[model samples]
Target: DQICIGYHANNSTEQVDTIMEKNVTVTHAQDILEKTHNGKLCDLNGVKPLILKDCSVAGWLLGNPMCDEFIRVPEWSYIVERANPVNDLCYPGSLNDYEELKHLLSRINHFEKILIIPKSSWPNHETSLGVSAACPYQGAPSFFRNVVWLIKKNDAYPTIKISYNNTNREDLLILWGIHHSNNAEEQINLYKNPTTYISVGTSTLNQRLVPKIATRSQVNGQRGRMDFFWTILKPDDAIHFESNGNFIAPEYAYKIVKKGDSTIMKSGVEYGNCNTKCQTPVGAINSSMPFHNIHPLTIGECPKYVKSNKLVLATGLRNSPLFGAIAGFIEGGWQGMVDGWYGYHHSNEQGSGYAADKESTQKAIDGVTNKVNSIIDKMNTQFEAVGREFNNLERRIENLNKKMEDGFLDVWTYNAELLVLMENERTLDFHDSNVKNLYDKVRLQLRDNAKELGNGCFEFYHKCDNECMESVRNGTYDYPQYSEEARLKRE
Candidate 1:
C-alpha cells in the first residue's frame, strides 16, 4: 500500500528513516487524523483528537499541540510611549560659533535655520577681547552694517524677501547678528520681521526665543552644524554651501589640510623613496664596512651603494659570525689584527689564497649551495603535491557535475560531494597558509646557508693566515711585512 508523507512536526521524528521514501500528499489536517486513527488516534505526545486538514502520516505521527502557541506568538510584547518634542532650536549652529556655549544649543530643532555672519563684522580687535565683547550690542554699528550688506548682497534668505515692517508675524525670524541682552520683552521688540525668533549663535535672544516659539527639535537630541544643516537646508543647498561656497566646518577644513600635508610627507619625491631604494632599511644599522661590501647580506636592491664611497652598514648583524670576525679585527689582539690584514689582501685577489685555503673555501661554498638547493627542492615538492591534490579535487568535481547532469546524483548530494572535494584542495585555498609555512622555512634555510657560506670563506682565509703567521714567528717561513694602518685605509 502507498502511504503519504508530509512535514515532520517534531525534533524526535526529524530523521525518521521510513518517512522520506513514501509518496508526498497535499491534504488538510482533520482528514489525515480521521483517516489514520478513525477518531481515536493521537500523536506520541498523548494529545488526543488532533484537529488538522489534509495531513499525511508524517504530520500525524509528529504533531505536537504544545508547540502550536510557541510557533504562533513566539514571545510577549510591551508597549511604551515615545517622548518626542517639537520646536526646540539648538544653539551654536555653525563651526564658527563658540564651543563652550555648545551645551545650551545641544537641543535639536527640525525647522531651524543656520545664519552665517561675516567674520569681518566682528572686528579682529573686539573678537580678541572675548565672546561677550564681540556681541552685537557692544559692536552694534559694525554688526548691523554687515547684516544689512549681507541681505543686500542676496546672500541671506535667497528664497524669500519679506520686509520687517509688513512681513508675516508667524514667520521664523532667523537672526544672524549677535545679541547680549537677556531681557525677553526687549529682544522680542527688536525683531520687527517675526515675533517667532530663533537666533543661530549664543545670544540672550537665543535663550529667550525658545520659551516663546513652539519650534521643533531633532529626534536624535544632539546639536551641531551638521545637525543644523540636515534639519534646515535642502540637499542642493548643503552641497552649494559645502562645495561651491566658503561655508564648511572648521574640523572639516582642518582634516583636508591634514590629509594634504600627510600626502606630501609620505610621497617619494618629497621625502625620498628610502623603502624601495633600500629594502628593509628602517630597522637596519650601519656596519664597519662600506655598503658595497655588505650589499650581499643586506638584501637591498640599490646598485648605487656599490659606487658610493660612504661607509655604510646593514643592521641585524650582531649575532652573525661575520660581524664578530670584523669586530675582532678592529678591536682584538695582534693575532686577530694580522688575520684581518691577510683576509683583506686575499679577498682583493681571488687567486692569492693557498691551495688548502682555496680548497676549504670551495668545499664550504659547495656545501651551502647544495643545502640551499635542497631546501628549494623541498618547497617545490610540496607545491607540486598541493597542485596534484587540487587537480584531483577539480577532476572529482567535474565527474560529480557529469553525474548530476546524467540524473545519477541529486543536487543536495552533489553539493555535499563538491564541498568535500574543495576542502581537500589545500593549495587552492586563497590564504595559502600551508604554502606560506613551507616557503618561510625554505627562505630562512636559504638565508642562513648563504650567510654561512660568506663567513666560511673568511674563516678559511683566517685559518691560512694563522698557520702562515705561526710558521713565520718560528722562523720556518718567510712573508712580507704588513701594517694595520695600511690595511685599514680605503683605496
Candidate 2:
C-alpha cells in the first residue's frame, strides 16, 4: 500500500481543490528550502526524449553503469523543492550531468557502476580510457571540466545496457580529467562526498558558494602580511547582511545545528546589529560551523575557528550602547521579543518570557550596564585630557604675545626721549639773532626729529595694536567686560 501525505484545509472534503491542496504535503513559502532543481544530471543531450513528450510534468533520466542498471524517474516527485517560484525548466547546462552522476553514485559503489559505454564493447576493453580522452562538446560549458569526468566513469561499469535515445549525431565526447582517475593499484577517491551537498538557489546557495573577497593583503617579494577572517554562519541561523560599525550581537552569534558531520538545518531568520532586512537560511548555510555568541568560553568551546587576527589583542563581545539600551527593554518585557523561530519583533510585549528569565536576563542587563559605564568613563577621560592640553597651549601663546607688546612699548619710549632732547636744544638757540644760521639749523633739526619721533610712535602703536587683536581673536587673552580696572583707568 502507498502512503500518501497531505495538507487539507477542510477535512470533510477529500477532493483536490487548489494545487497545494492536491499535493501530498503542502509546504508554505517559508517552509520550503531555497534551491533550484532541473533534471540535467544524467543526459548530455539537450533534451530528454521520454520526459519532454509531457512538458507539463518534469522528470529525471539517467543510466548508472556502476550499479549495472539505469534509474529513470519519470516526473520524479520531490526533485529540487524550494521557496523560489516554480519555473519548470531548472537545470539547463552540462553541469547537470555531474549532479545526475553524483545522485546516482551515492546509491551504489563507484567501482561497480561504470558511467559510460562498457569497456568489453570497445576494441580493446578500453571504453573508459577512450571516453576520457574524447573532447567534451563545449556548446554548454560546465563550471569545471572535472565534473564531466565524474559522469563518464559513472556509465563505464561492467554489464551495462546501451539504450538509444538519439538526438545528436555526434557521440558525446568525454573530456579527460572530467572523470576521477586512480591507478588500479591505488584507491579511487571520490571528488565530492554524498552527505556534502548544496542545493542550487539564487538567494540561498549562490550567497554561500559564490567566491567572495575573503580578506585583503599587500604582498612583498612573494607573500605579504596575511590576515584572514570569515563569518561561517549556519543555514538556519539568523544573519545581518549589512552594518555601520562592528556589529556583534546576532551578527556575531549563530545557532549551529548539525546532521552527522554535515550541517542541514536551514530555517531561521536573523536581526539586530543595525540590520533592517530579514533573511531565510534554507540554502544559505555554510558547510563549516560558525562561531557562537556566548563568550568567555573554555579552550574547547572557543571560536578560534573564527579568528579576528588582530595585533592589538582583543576578543569576546564588545558592549555597544545601542545594544545596551535595547537589552533592558527586552529583558523587562517593555518591548516584545522578536519571534525566536523567524527572528522578528512584534509590537505587543508578548513572547518575551524567555528574555525575562531571572539568571539569563540579569546577566544580559549587567553586561550592558558595564558597557555603558565603560563608554562614559572613556569619554570623560578624553574630555579632561583635551581641556588640559588647551590650557597649556593657550598660556604659551599669551606669554609670547606679551613679550611682543613689551618690545613695541620700549621702542616708543626711546623715540619720545629723543624728541624731547632735540626740542630743548632748539628752544635754547631760539634767542640768538646774530647766530641766526646756527639757530635756524637747530630749529630745522628739531622739526625733522619731531616728525621722525611721530612716525616711530605710530609704528610702535600699530604693532602693539596688532599683537593685542591677534591674542583676542585666538582666545589667548581674556577680554574683560565691565571690569573695575578698565572703568577706573578710562575715567
Candidate 3:
C-alpha cells in the first residue's frame, strides 16, 4: 500500500486526516519498511527504490551504514527537507553538494516507495548524513535552497511494489543511554505502543535517566527557565532502584519516586557504617551469600514496592548524618527483620572487622550515644557552676545594700564602701551574662552534633521520655524546654 507519510509532524492528526481525505493510505517509515520486508527480518535491498520525502530521514539513513546498500541502488530516491526559513540553515556550506546529489538522484527512474521523515527527528542533526561537510555545487549560493530544489521533482507512486517486513506487537522497548528531548512531555511522546518500557541511565542513579528539574537559559540572558515533571510514575508502577557506585554521602544514594496521588517514597542506605578508610556493613550478613558491601536492596517486600502509600525506606547507620530519624519506619514496621547492609567484604576472614548483626550494631550505636551524653553532662556541670557563682554574687549584693542603709560609719567611708559595692554589682552582672551566653551556645552545638548520630539515639532519648515519644508519634521530636532545675535534677 502507498501510505501518505508524515513523520514528526507538528499537527500529525490533522495532517493524517488531510491525507485520508485525499484517498491515500497514511503510514510511517516503519510501516513502509515492514511492508517491503514481507514481515521478516531482511537486508535494506528488500525495500529497493525507497523514497525519503524529507532531508531528515535521508540524513538519518545516511548516518546508519545499514541502509547504505539501499541508497546505492539507482531506483531509491529522497527529497531534501530544508530549514523552515531556508536561510536559518546552521550549515550553509552544504548547499552545493546537496543540490548536486538531488540532481543526480532525480535522473533515476527505478523509485519504488516514498518515505517522509523530519530533520528534527533525525538521530543527530549536527553530525549525521554529511550535514557537517561542505557543499561541492558551484552554482548553489544557499545550501538549504539547493536541498529544497533537489527533492521536489521525485514521483510519489500510488502503490509500493516491494514486499516489506510486517511485525506483531512489540513486547519490550528498552531505552539505553538515549536522550530524546529536553522537555519531559516531548520525551514521553517518543513512546507510542509497548507492553513494558524501561529507561536506563548511562550514569549513576539519581543523576541521569530519572526525571528532575532542569534549568535552561531564556531569551533574556538575565534569568533562566526551570522545568520539571511533577510526577514520573503512575499508581502500581514499581521501579527497581539500584546504583553501583560509591558516594560521599552513601545514605543519599537511593531512588526517590512520586506516585499518582503526589506522595513521594524516598529510599536511602538503611544500615551501614563508614570509617575514615571505607564503609562497612554494621548489621547482619548472610553467611550463605558471598561477603560483599551490605547495602539496602529494594526487595519485593519493601514498603516502596508493596503498598502504594507515601512510604519512605530511609536507612542509615547510627552515626549517619541523618541520625536515627531514618530508623523511624524500619523500627516501626520490620522489627526483627534484618535488611542486609552494603560494605567491603573480606573473603579470607568472614565477619572480620565488622559488626556481625543487629545486637552488635545496637552496641555501636549505644557507645556513640553514651559519649554524647557524657559531653552533655559536662556542659550541664559547667552551667551549674556558673549558676552558683551568680547566686553568691546576688547574696553579696544584698548584704552590701543593707550595709549602705545602716548609718554605722562616717559619710566619707560609707560613700567609699557604697562605690565599691556598686562596682562589684556591675562585675557580677557582666560575668553572669557572659556565662549564660556561653552555656546556651555550647548546648545548641551539642544538640546539633548529636542529631548527626541519628535521631532517636541521643537528643530524642535525652530530651523525651516514653510519654514524649508517644505524643510525637508522627515523626517529630519536641525537645523539652530548657530549665536550670531540670538540669540540676538530671545531674
Sort every candidate by TM-score, greatest first: 1, 3, 2
Q: How many residue pairs clash in each candidate?
A: 21, 27, 30
Deviation of model 3 at 102, angstroms: 6.0
Candidate 2 lDDT, 62-113, residue by residue in tens: 1111211122232211122222222212221122233333233222211111
TM-score for candidate 3? 0.14
- Candidate 2 vs. true structure, TM-score: 0.13
Q: State the lDDT at 103 in candidate 3.
A: 36
Can you give the lDDT of residue 111 in candidate 3? 28
Model 2 residue 120 lDDT score: 41
Report every candidate's CA lDDT: 0.22, 0.22, 0.23
Most lDDT-accurate candidate: 3
Q: What CA root-mean-square deviation does each model show from the true structure?
A: 33.5, 37.4, 37.2
Which regions of candidate 2 deviate over 4 angstroms? 1-70, 75-121, 126-491
Give the number of the best model, judged by TM-score.
1
